[PDB]
Design a protein around this ligand. Structure first.
Ligand SMILES: Nc1ncnc2c1ncn2[C@@H]1O[C@H](COP(=O)(O)OP(=O)(O)OP(O)(O)=S)[C@@H](O)[C@H]1O
Ligand SMILES: Nc1ncnc2c1ncn2[C@@H]1O[C@H](COP(=O)(O)OP(=O)(O)OP(O)(O)=S)[C@@H](O)[C@H]1O
Ligand SMILES: Nc1ncnc2c1ncn2[C@@H]1O[C@H](COP(=O)(O)OP(=O)(O)OP(O)(O)=S)[C@@H](O)[C@H]1O
Ligand SMILES: [Mg+2]
Ligand SMILES: [Mg+2]
Ligand SMILES: [Mg+2]
Lengths: 432, 95, 432, 432, 432
DNA sequence: GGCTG
DNA sequence: TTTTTTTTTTTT
């Protein structure tokens, strides 16, 4: 792709500003390509700017080449157009081309070194290095990546870092004062947050409560159900928002008039957002399905979700690993990594649930080691809270939430706090 | 393995097969024959896609029609048991 | 029209947004078209953008297929050119083409399955699906219409949601009052309910009692026994319905006149469904087997069940995992998930039994952690009930049913109640 | 000179005793030479003596060779003869020939590796080392010599032992006196130091504390963070050095004036180094990328580090194994070897932080049978510490270090000591 | 091979006396070889001595052979040389040749028997054995071995066994009178011997003392260390051999002159062995790595040890266990079995040490029941010496040696004895 | 008019 | 070579 590289060197300043630092005559060819690049390099050295086609042709006329090389250079120069290709693909492809040409040159160099070594000392050339220089030669040709950014400096960039301290746009408040207190301003965008507990303890209850709280704050919430139906989860959201009950909905205690009135009153609010509930069969979805779902949602409706709730990571299906290719520690961690990558790509707060092994299903406390699936999930996670319910707690309708992995704030400042879980309304209530 | 006894025994086994030709150059031993497993090509009666290669470590039969590929010993064991008896015996005779 | 599809995938952003989510590699050809689409798909997966002609040529040069394939792809790429078109004709034509190719691939796979199953065993080229899933594949060939359902909106779609609360066709009431009270109207269609008792405590007596109670309430019941004969289960049902002890049948204390009279008296009652008992060898039936049984029941016997009962899920075979490949956890979780999928597919109340661990036997209390073969079964089950029997309870002809996983209501309320199991009549009676 | 080598292996004894343990079948061409050497090696393995000409002619007849191979071996055996020469030119000539053959084999292997790498996925060979493994192979071939050291020979290697007694390696001191006590003056230059810990217990806290301590001693520190943003690591460093809590920075308790004043006060001190934080995506950086970063730091910023710090070993790329090719143990061991090679090449103290297994989490004591990803890390590492802040050390604002593998001193002298971890300032204080 | 067999029958004595009883005419051929062997056998029968070439030619001249037989025998006789092959290879190869020929003859005989069996009963040979004799005939073919040594035959090896009891062929002395007294002449080859150290006793002091004592007696000692480097172990060895205190070397009191003088004084003595110290990482050396180390030492260093001393059994890793627990019973039992198997297969005295039980630590008396390794070490250990160091013994520079398991002799003969431990020179001296 | 692994 | 479920067994 030498023609593309030369064309975007001449006709693109952004490409020239990221590739010219790392470019040599040895990288291109031994024929017209090398001569064209040599003309470009000579012109940029004599005059610190990217040459044009007319200037390049004038320089070619000034420079001296044999007939074949002159014809080759003229033909190659004739073949240059703007062709506005993508910048990311262009830089990746030119990095690959540079790496492969450098590897080829290094292999030829070490082969020449080996051939010269076998020659008698009188015949051998003293310019070529000894065989002991073979490894590092092959190593400097493996460190030619395109990266001009060196990183922070802590003394030359403290002003920029202080300005970054004032960028709180990543934070998303919780609508619960205790959660904001323990997260130092709520959850952050592009993070994998997990709410783990035992079986039939209220994981989906907590997920729906978070969805309702984010909906009442004006966010766009995408609830992805993996076990329940769309109407069942929407019933829990209705119980949270309208605040009547779960049984009263199914027992007819709510007259249509009241339901319509409450729904229209919530519609009148300008602080309300949008909630979309999507159901998938067990073991049939991941970020690859989630990305297509995101694109379809954005196309069909003006819906770009700020919060993405996954009913359970375990029920989800990994992208690369098959359904039962490897064990739990791998594919579960792979799904966790894929979900975190999706969240950081979409810049959205990702919430999911996790199961706890049978050892802590009836215990007053649960630790991080009590994760039913892979322990890599409490490595990709950022705010892994835990829900613990006992008989005394269920008597007071107060689930205990223990801070298990706290990346935002101090995990041990408020380690265990009581919530006011109302199971009929599918709502978490703060305790004061 | 013993290549020359495989060449000698294979020839007799493939001699019965029609379209039998001895493709023997100065350094190789091959036998061309109609494949007895599939009858070779149904449309073309004159094609002989069954081949025996005895220049390797083990003389192997390969069919280019029905993708049959076997050693000469398995071929003799499965199709010519009277020839298979002497074949495995003559091995001890020379070894 | 593959050339048009590829050209408008390249030179049309609007076309790519709708058709891409659905385009697949098996819809074009076995030659140049499939290779070009694979190049485009790889570029999209690597850069999340539509490749240009230059990018396609670069990827073509960095490809390993032979000279014929290279020439075909080069010609196809050179032939790609944008044309003045209209979004509608292209989307509809692409939908027609994709549907036709899906049907063609489906019928080719159907023919392959038929010609593979008609082969002697141990030479049938395993990993090929059996004839049983011949129609289902065709059902997948018809569910491709460029009309993916984005999901359910909480505020936009709430009239349809409200027209699902007084419908109540999802819930199937019990006959015992306590079970209706704890489940708030009975079990729901498309669910998986489980009984955990142990060994020789109940757990098939309870299933037979449920089958009899549903049969009395005008229901079509399909009992599936993996560990007992069709006549033993029918004998249990006879003992339940006719109020004659199993000992009386064994000891011949009931005459043919009484048996005939009771059977005819039950037959003449309008409030009575049809119960059908089917027996499979242990480990020789799966979800696909049950679907085949459902189809042959609908056709031959015009029998459409709603209360499908399976004696033990642990005794069934997974329809996806090879036998004895994965451990008990994964296999049992998969079996339970497949059974729940079958239940939601045919919209029936699915009832099953599950063993407890050896440590729970002869214990006054059984916890959820005492589940025998998998911890995933409680996670993938709508309702579970634990049957506990002690010496004192046995002497009182009673059993303690504990609500272990209650997805239809709050399990803390009415967690443990005493049923009056009568083991002679294979019947559950209340104490209220 | 293969014929001479075989002739003097057969007909000479001192030559055989000197050269046999280093000869290999790969050093001979695939013609008669390799087969003859195979016969000789088989005879030596079966009878522990050098075969004669009759023995080999018997072995040739009792061999499964083709006519061409048989004729070549017989001709080569016939051509063998005992040419009288000197047993000082033969040994060196054989060593030269073996070195040349090893270099030739390495060159062929790296050419095959480069050819394999350029192949597209799903067609390329697996278990074949990637491009980054090329220099290491070339380092092995140059190490071939007829001199081998297997173990330490008393009375034969005692000058070196006396040198080891009298001489001590240079040490880069810590700022914590306890680490100097347990390391006899600090850590050496070409070392790989690991600080294992559980999830969310202070892996990055300890590494940032070490980075701050080294920065206050005038070292150039490079912090390669594979999980956290550059601003986050630099904020940890600021909290360590400016004596301001992370809560104060996030809440805005400190003003820009105080921050600037403290930064300038630190700048005016002459005993300060340069700390540069570089962030890479998870799995996106390897040893070669680190070498490229070092090259650009030296060229564009005049920066040569000494205390290179990697946030997490388990996230970095293998650089020797293709992604998702081998198991976790092999990949992590390869990463450790690559990082130690980089540290030796750059003469930089390299510090990292691996993760312990789920068992070691919340465990009051840990050992070498607790490392999650790979148990081969201690073998590759030069100093390994642990963090045991499980249940009550957090309440007391303390920690615990196990000293799992200490090559600088003796691990069973100060094996367990208490560290005063302060999480607000992200530092370690001593209990003394 | 027949030419070699005949040549070394004519021109050798040990080969003749070894292979003549197992030599038959039917083993050679039906041509020149058979006739030559018949001539040899006739000459040896008429004159009980090996014939010479001239005598063989005279016998051939005075013999009844045709022209072709005469030519073949003459050529074969002229083709026999007195070349010197090694005896072991010659005997093994002629044994293989004889076995192959006997098997071929037996197979031909059974084929002929079967062919004769399938013949008209009126028409068959009477001399041919019946079919029922086939299994016996093959047995006579399989019962052909130049030398029969399957195990130890009582009443058939009593003279050789007595030479073992008088020559003490298995015992290896200790250089300590007390240890020789309780072992009836020292430890035995192919044994595993362990030391049990109570609280306050080092495990490597006793092992280094034993290594030094064996070194002074002329034995090749291989010391494999786990928790220590080669230099440290060799420094302990130097402390014991050069009489220099261990701390004096580190302080620098002993100069290079005295060190070199003492080392050369030891080297002058011809009663000194070789000590090879090899270091392995903790848990990175199973008893299969030791086999590779022995193979490398034999091939490269020509060092075949008689004593192998492993620094610590617990630090080692069990083979075929795939696990390495810090202190687990199953691993210790497997490690002991593997090490004893290595000792048996290498005919070496193997030494190791373990820690006694905590109760054994507190109690001066140590019971086999009071051992950290219970039923695992006092089951695979030929000798288990227990070392007790209390306050009173330490004040007197002594350690109480107790005999906990003695396969060699009676355990209760001399169970308790006081040993003069010097912790500075790492030495054990006797007590009068 | 040959061609395999 | 690790990882995770379940079971069964045994040792301390
Ligand atoms: N024929 C019978 N007559 C009287 N009582 C019976 C009879 N069969 C079973 N029972 C009683 O019913 C109880 C439970 O029976 P089942 O339902 O078969 O138990 P089970 O749990 O299904 O057995 P498994 O181990 O799950 S196959 C037994 O403990 C007996 O007391
Ligand atoms: N219809 C209902 N009416 C009242 N309470 C209910 C109802 N359904 C569930 N609950 C309560 O909700 C609690 C836990 O709710 P769930 O969301 O089912 O917990 P979860 O099982 O972790 O979430 P899943 O498995 O993803 S549905 C149960 O213990 C019940 O007390
Ligand atoms: N913003 C913060 N303010 C106060 N304490 C914090 C903050 N962030 C983290 N911590 C504490 O720092 C501890 C150690 O965190 P880390 O340095 O990230 O350890 P870690 O091993 O790197 O965690 P990983 O990388 O997710 S396994 C946590 O357990 C918290 O208690
Ligand atoms: Mg649940
Ligand atoms: Mg049953
Ligand atoms: Mg970290």
């Amino acid at each position: 792709m030498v023609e593309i590289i030369l064309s975007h060197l001449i006709f693109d300043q952004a490409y020239f500003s990221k590739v010219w630092p790392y470019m040599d005559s040895e990288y291109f060819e031994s024929g017209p390509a090398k001569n064209t690049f040599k003309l470009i390099k000579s012109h940029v050295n004599e005059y610190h700017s990217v040459p044009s086609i007319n200037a390049l042709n004038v320089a070619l006329e000034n420079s001296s080449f044999t007939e074949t090389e002159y014809s080759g250079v003229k033909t190659l120069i004739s073949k240059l157009a703007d062709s506005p290709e993508d910048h990311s693909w262009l830089v990746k492809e030119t990095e690959k081309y540079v790496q492969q040409r450098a590897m080829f040159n290094a292999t030829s160099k070490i082969i020449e070194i080996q051939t010269n070594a076998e020659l008698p000392p009188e015949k051998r050339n003293k310019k070529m290095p000894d065989v002991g220089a073979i490894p590092d030669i092959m190593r400097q040709a493996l460190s030619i990546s395109f990266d001009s950014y060196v990183g922070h400096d802590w003394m030359d960039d403290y002003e920029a870092r202080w300005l970054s301290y004032m960028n709180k746009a990543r934070k998303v408040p919780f609508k619960l004062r205790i959660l904001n207190k323990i997260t130092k301003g709520g959850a952050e965008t592009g993070t994998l947050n997990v709410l783990m507990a035992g079986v039939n303890v209220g994981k989906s209850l907590g997920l729906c409560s978070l969805a309702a709280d984010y909906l009442q704050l004006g966010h766009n919430v995408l609830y992805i159900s993996m076990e329940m139906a769309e109407e069942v989860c929407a019933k829990r959201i209705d119980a949270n928002m309208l605040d009547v009950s779960l049984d009263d909905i199914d027992d007819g205690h709510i007259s249509y008039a009241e339901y319509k009135g409450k729904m229209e009153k919530w519609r009148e609010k300008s602080t309300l957002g949008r909630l979309i509930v999507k159901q998938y069969p067990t073991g049939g979805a991941d970020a690859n399905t989630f990305r297509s779902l995101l694109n379809e949602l954005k196309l069909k409706k003006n819906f770009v979700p700020t919060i993405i709730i996954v009913d359970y990571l375990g029920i989800c299906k990994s992208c690369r690993i098959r359904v039962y290719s490897e064990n739990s520690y791998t594919t579960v961690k792979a799904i966790a990594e894929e979900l975190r990558a999706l969240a950081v790509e979409t810049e959205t707060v990702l919430w999911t649930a996790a199961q706890v092994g049978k050892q802590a299903w009836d215990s007053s406390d649960v630790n991080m080691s009590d994760i039913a699936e892979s322990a890599g999930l409490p490595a990709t996670a950022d705010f892994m809270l835990a829900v613990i319910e006992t008989e005394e707690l269920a008597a007071a309708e107060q689930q205990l939430i223990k801070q298990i992995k706290s990346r935002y704030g101090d995990k041990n400042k408020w380690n265990k706090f009581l919530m006011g879980v109302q199971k009929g309304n599918q709502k978490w209530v703060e305790i004061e | 393995s013993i290549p020359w006894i495989d060449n000698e025994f294979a020839y007799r086994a493939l001699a019965h097969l029609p379209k039998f030709t001895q493709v023997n150059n100065s350094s190789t031993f091959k036998l061309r024959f109609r494949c007895p497993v599939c009858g070779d090509s149904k449309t073309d009666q004159n094609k002989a896609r069954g081949w025996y290669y005895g220049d390797n470590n083990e003389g192997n039969i390969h069919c280019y029609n029905c993708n049959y590929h076997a050693p000469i010993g398995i071929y003799l064991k499965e199709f010519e048991p009277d020839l298979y008896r002497e074949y495995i015996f003559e091995i001890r005779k020379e070894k």
